[PDB]
Design a binder for this molecule. Structure first.
Ligand code: SJ5
Ligand code: SJ5
Lengths: 596, 596
């Protein structure tokens, strides 16, 4: 990467100033902004909170559902004392793609809506003056970038996003924005990897800087005491009597990376890390050499009004709920979350399966969204797939570079419900997995979540995985309700087929659930009732517990969340175990009791 | 009584024809019906279902809330073959009071809205012709009849019922209406009482007829086989190897009462009865000589649209729900129910505490409903109480005469939450209890439900009871929510005071509960949430289980039910364990599991 993914810090060498607040915002349905000079200021803006998704503020459909180009603008005073620094705009994300301007000048563009965008404004920044940032953003969906979908043009020319995925197309500036100042020679990246040696541990590391001066690396314990120190851009820190980062029992050291010229220090980067190992051994997931059974949820970045907008309050409530259920794990379904989620998981000892936004790659869904009105003959995969692969690999590189040093991150999920039953899909995913392994200094477990279409007899992609994640809805989409006994039979039949393959890898259920409307009670239960959610879960548990190789269960979903409206979604997806405002349905206690 | 309470049957001697259906109905706000000849036909009626409460059909407030005089009318063809019979109109009830006319002639009047009204139309009936019935009904509330309340006159002259009780003032013809034909000499009443003699049983009986001819009494088993036979209006039936009626395990014999003149039979009455004994022994409630712990609910006659209207479907669903909770008992809070409820309890082996409508006799409530707008000085108890007592005793006599022969009925509840802390209240209730014992051939246990105001140090009436029923809301009305630990302390303090009295009688909690809005979930719980209902119940159980003498628990209420609207009632009373359409809230399983 031609920029650093490192989270920004404030110290003697590095400065940061938040640009969060009310920005100026303007929709550009006619796509006239750039030729009209909007990069120098929006002509008729409204106010827009940052961070937030824009959609749910408005009271009219066309603004909520807006699809196309739209622009953000703000101004900030740059301290004069930042003069002799490399000055960057850092967006937590720009959803889905955008071009950043500063003081009227084009700085950078980015594709991918869920990872940081770094824009080097050093050459146009005006220290000791007010500066301007303008961002052109686009939220259309296509088949050459993630997540996948289509864009429909309505009779009036109005665009409408048509996802191939089951979540609302929230977009905008959904995460915090900073302007930061770095030393001219700085720490750009580092990687740690761990080895356990009895009571001791080794922290292997690499550091990438933007210069040639010597590097010193120190490790401090949770009290700030020096426990190890070495020199060089590559090395090993030896930690006596190491306090390991444990599941639901975190311990964090602080790594301190210094660039020196002998006379003094040029840069200092510090970050909390946790000494822990993760590996797959047969059907076991080993954390610090001991098996762990994953218990938790797929989540979303989703909350009323804010949409995917980041807020520490959502983090705090969600973790309190997670702990109350006795969970130990979540998957970042279906995109990398704001960095703060991982920082907090590190502190709380939660395990994370970190997922790239490779969702929407199922052919039947694509075809369905094309058949709506209307198309049944024209598709061009041969042309788009190579471009999609490039985008997928780029997002993977960005995710892993951003997240690798979190002790919480124990696995990469490289897809959710793609086509996997052709040799072509194998060749596609082989490249993604190869890239992931190359970018991950730890070479930690890699996986993806498979839809039921990936039958054990047909799937060509599970051998790429270190463990296999299954999304299954036996008792919801398949043989629901009065047919639930048949659902259980079908589920056991499938798992018997997996069993007979004797793959000797762990299986984790990454999704299972039922839409459940809080307050819908029925005796006997019906699909959509709270009681049916409980019974469905009990049936699933009986199945899970029948197979030795099943080593985790992440329910879909932690909480009800927003989707595109339609005949199958009653104000979003109601498969939450909690409501959207984070309160438990009856099924939450079922998990609490089982996971205790 | 100058009529029979016996449920109507169809045989060679007795005939019955249902008058249920759409009747004619007219409100009489100006109170002009009788002087205008409405007893000969209503001049501008609308259609009204019978059985039903009238209120919830209408779409306008004034009709729903109507209070005052209103009239019903129907016509029926009387079979010519009924010529030589005593012909009666039998109303399951007329709520609250009314006068029955037939063919333009005044037949009878009745005060009390929850027990049968019998009108002898023999002298005006026209066999082989169409006949007419017209009923003038009034639904006002006062302090000289049950249940108690007031009637407010609004500025326009419009009346409004102001109950002193927490249920909606439903009224009309809420139960089935029959026209029946009896022999000129008939069985008017009978009573059975049981004694257990090892494997055998004795059925002591009395029969009252309207003549002097000899009586023969037979007992048939459940297969119709004769197991005992004797002669005389008083006698004992000896039953070898008797199959006792047991809790949740009913067995019903059929008693057959014949009047003969030697040549032939003049009348035959048959009814199912169950051989069982009930007595209080120290702190134990003994059913067939074995202790039973009561588990169940207070109910209501309440269902959407029908109001208190009787329907066997409500009975069937409610009993299935009761059985699913593992209940064995209900109280007919706060009025005798339709007879069919008891017939079904007999079949299902449920225990019933049968309650007369002596509810609304708390002074604070009376004063409150008077202070509303407006009165704080004028009350006239010295004058009304003697009339109230007469009404209360009459209703008690009617209830016991109607219900005594149901094996399900194991106790009479003679009040719900009256004043009990004065010697005057003692003298009042002494008369009611004396009357009850006189009317009950079995002299079975007598009780009433006490409000918290009846402190152990102050109450003068509990010594009248064979067992004591307490309604308590520690954790709802007293120290709810964040104060629930204090509520438990206060509850234990009160029960410690009862304990120290060493009364050596059983205590049954006849009410405890929390308003709970289906679908309101919160973590941590709040008052009104489903989770709080569960926690409140668990706290109550801990208290109940701390006292040896507590021998039953009937939760308030089986199901959400209609009340007068107001700032404390969110579409009725939500203390149901089930919703009004009979579906379980989370707390229902708490009962199911405990009562199993
Ligand atoms: O249909 C569902 O509820 C889920 C199916 N698997 C993918 C999820 O994004 C989706 O939300
Ligand atoms: O307040 C309540 O919920 C109850 C209190 N005891 C009497 C009931 O009729 C009433 O419904």
């Amino acid at each position: 990467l031609e920029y650093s993914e490192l989270y920004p810090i404030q110290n003697e060498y590095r400065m940061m100033q938040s640009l969060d607040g009310m920005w100026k915002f303007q929709f550009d349905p006619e796509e006239i902004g750039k030729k009209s000079g909007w990069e120098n200021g929006l002509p008729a803006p409204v106010s827009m909170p940052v961070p937030s998704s824009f959609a749910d503020f408005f009271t009219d459909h066309k603004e909520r559902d807006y699809c196309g180009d739209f622009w953000y603008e703000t101004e900030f005073y740059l301290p004069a004392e930042w003069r002799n620094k490399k000055i960057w705009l850092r967006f937590g994300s720009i959803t889905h793609r955008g071009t950043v301007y500063c003081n009227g000048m084009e700085i950078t563009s980015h594709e991918g809506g869920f990872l940081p965008v770094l824009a080097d404004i050093s050459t146009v920044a005006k220290p000791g003056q007010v500066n301007q940032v303008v961002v052109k953003i686009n939220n259309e969906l296509n088949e050459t970038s993630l997540p996948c979908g289509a864009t429909k043009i309505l009779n009036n020319g109005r665009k409408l996003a048509k996802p191939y995925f089951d979540f609302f197309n929230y977009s905008g500036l959904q995460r915090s924005v900073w302007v930061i100042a770095l030393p001219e020679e700085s720490v750009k990246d580092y990687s740690v990897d761990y080895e356990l040696c009895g009571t001791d541990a080794l922290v292997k590391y690499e550091v990438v800087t933007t210069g040639e001066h010597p590097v010193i690396v120190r490790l401090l314990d949770a009290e700030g005491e020096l426990v190890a120190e070495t020199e060089g851009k590559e090395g090993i820190l030896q930690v006596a009597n190491a306090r390991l980062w444990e599941v639901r029992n975190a311990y964090l050291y602080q790594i301190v990376i210094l660039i020196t010229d002998g006379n003094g220090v040029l840069d200092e980067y510090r970050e909390k890390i946790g000494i822990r190992t993760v590996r797959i051994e047969g059907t076991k997931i080993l954390l610090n050499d001991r098996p762990v059974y994953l218990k938790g949820f797929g989540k979303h970045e989703d909350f009323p009004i804010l949409g995917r907008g980041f807020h520490w309050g959502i983090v705090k409530r969600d973790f309190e709920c997670l702990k109350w259920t006795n969970a130990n794990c979540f998957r970042t379904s279906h995109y990398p979350y704001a960095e703060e989620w991982y920082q907090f998981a590190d502190e709380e000892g939660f395990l994370i399966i970190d997922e790239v936004p490779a969702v929407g790659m199922m052919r039947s869904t694509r075809n369905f969204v094309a058949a709506g009105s209307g198309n049944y003959t024209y598709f061009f995969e041969a042309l788009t797939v190579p471009e999609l692969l490039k985008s997928h690999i780029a997002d993977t590189e960005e995710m892993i570079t951003r997240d690798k040093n979190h002790p919480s991150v124990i696995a990469w999920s490289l897809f959710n419900e793609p086509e996997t039953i052709t040799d072509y899909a194998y060749e596609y995913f082989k490249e993604v997995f190869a890239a992931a392994e190359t970018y991950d200094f730890q070479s930690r477990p890699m996986t993806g979540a498979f839809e039921k279409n990936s039958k054990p007899e047909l799937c060509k992609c599970y051998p790429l995985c270190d463990f296999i994640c299954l999304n299954r809805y036996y008792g919801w989409y398949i043989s629901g309700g009065p047919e639930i006994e048949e659902a259980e039979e079908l589920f056991r039949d499938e798992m018997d087929r997996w069993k007979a393959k004797e793959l000797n890898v762990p299986f984790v259920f990454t999704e299972f659930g039922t839409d459940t409307m809080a307050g819908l009670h029925k005796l006997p239960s019906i699909m959509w009732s709270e009681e049916y959610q409980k019974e469905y879960l009990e049936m699933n548990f009986r199945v899970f517990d029948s197979y030795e190789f099943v080593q985790g269960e992440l329910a879909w979903n932690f909480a009800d969340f927003q989707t595109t409206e339609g005949i199958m979604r009653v104000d979003g997806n109601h498969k939450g175990v909690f409501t959207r405002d984070r309160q438990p349905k009856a099924a939450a206690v079922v998990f609490k009791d089982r996971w205790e």
